[PDB]
Design a protein around this ligand. Structure first.
Ligand SMILES: [Cl-]
Length: 177
């Protein structure tokens, strides 16, 4: 149960994600991400785009059906009042791309946690343009301590949960629709 590993999909839960958060140590803004692949396709890591922040973890390179990937991110170290915000992209064996936005801000007086999930047609790397699409145009979900579901198209659907604080857990399940 370390970031950068894959685990059995059924093993993914908030406990595993707190373990991942705990291993980052007591930094101010951090995220543990778990994505359960029940899509019937194999996923291959493409890249992570960071608007702000960093990860020392290599995306789990291959995520088979029935496995969950674990990942993390943290704010840039030092006296910078910024959070951790980015987009993960995995290529799926059907030729399309699974994209996941996460956004954990610095200042909770003014901003909140958000996430999103989308399938793109073709093989599309995560980048600033994708961040802008997922954040400003494709109806992101609040990290509001509740579950949110949506159909993804392509025979898939998503269900996920993110909490509201600056030590964020993001648990996502991708299933057949
Ligand atoms: Cl906000």
């Amino acid at each position: 149960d370390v970031a950068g590993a894959v685990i059995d999909g059924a093993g993914l839960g908030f406990d595993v994600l707190k373990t991942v958060l705990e291993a980052l140590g007591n930094v101010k803004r951090k995220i543990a991400v778990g994505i359960d692949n029940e899509s019937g396709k194999t996923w291959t890591a493409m890249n992570t785009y960071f608007r702000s922040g960093t990860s020392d973890i290599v995306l789990p390179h291959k995520v088979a059906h029935g496995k969950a990937l674990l990942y993390n991110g943290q704010k840039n170290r030092g006296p910078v009042a910024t959070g951790v915000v980015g987009v993960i992209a995995y290529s799926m064996s059907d030729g399309n791309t699974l994209a996941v936005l996460f956004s954990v801000p610095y200042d909770y007086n003014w901003y909140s946690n958000w996430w999103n999930v989308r399938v793109y047609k073709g093989q599309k790397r995560a980048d600033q343009r994708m961040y802008e699409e997922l954040y400003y145009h494709r109806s992101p979900f609040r990290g509001d301590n509740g579950w949110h579901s949506r159909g993804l198209g392509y025979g898939l659907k998503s269900r996920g949960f993110m909490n509201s604080s600056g030590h964020a857990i993001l648990e996502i399940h991708v299933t057949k629709a």
